[PDB]
Amino acid sequence: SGAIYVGNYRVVNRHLATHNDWANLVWEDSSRDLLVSSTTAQGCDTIARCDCQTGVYYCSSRRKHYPVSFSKPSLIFVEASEYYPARYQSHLMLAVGHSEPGDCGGILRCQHGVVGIVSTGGNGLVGFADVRDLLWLDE
Ligand SMILES: NC(=O)[C@H]1CCCN(C(=O)[C@H](OCC2CCCC2)c2ccccc2)C1
Numbered sequence: 001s002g003a004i005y006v007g008n009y010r011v012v013n014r015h016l017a018t019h020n021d022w023a024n025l026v027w028e029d030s031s032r033d034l035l036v037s038s039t040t041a042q043g044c045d046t047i048a049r050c051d052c053q054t055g056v057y058y059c060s061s062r063r064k065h066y067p068v069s070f071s072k073p074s075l076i077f078v079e080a081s082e083y084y085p086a087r088y089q090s091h092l093m094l095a096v097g098h099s100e101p102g103d104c105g106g107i108l109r110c111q112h113g114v115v116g117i118v119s120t121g122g123n124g125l126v127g128f129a130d131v132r133d134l135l136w137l138d139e
């Protein structure tokens, strides 16, 4: 679990969004595994606006942060689940690292701020849903 709080927005994994998230829906993209809902309290997370390929992510299944090198956002294949059919997830970045179910929502950060959130795992890889292109989160 985990979320990003920026301005009057809350960014979460779409497959973990709550009834309150869907009742205050601003935007969702199943192909990205992202959902953004509105909040009343102001958020103070800073979103990174960059092309970094190195950063640090929080891994809840190890209670630890790990430094990683990660790929540029791209269309990558993902298998089925209580949540999705086998499909290509867009705007996804992979790194070599530990990720298991429960780790979704962990934040990946670079020196510029929040880059994305854990969205996929397995086979010794971790995949992050990028949020750096969502320029509207800042206004
Ligand atoms: N964005 C998606 O479509 C994801 C939805 C949840 C599921 N998912 C995954 O990639 C992994 O879960 C299934 C594996 C298969 C073998 C053991 C569990 C996973 C998720 C999070 C962290 C680590 C691993 C795909």
Ligand SMILES: [Zn+2]
Pocket (backbone or CB within 6 Å): 048, 049, 050, 051, 052, 110, 111, 112, 113
């Ligand atoms: Zn950066």
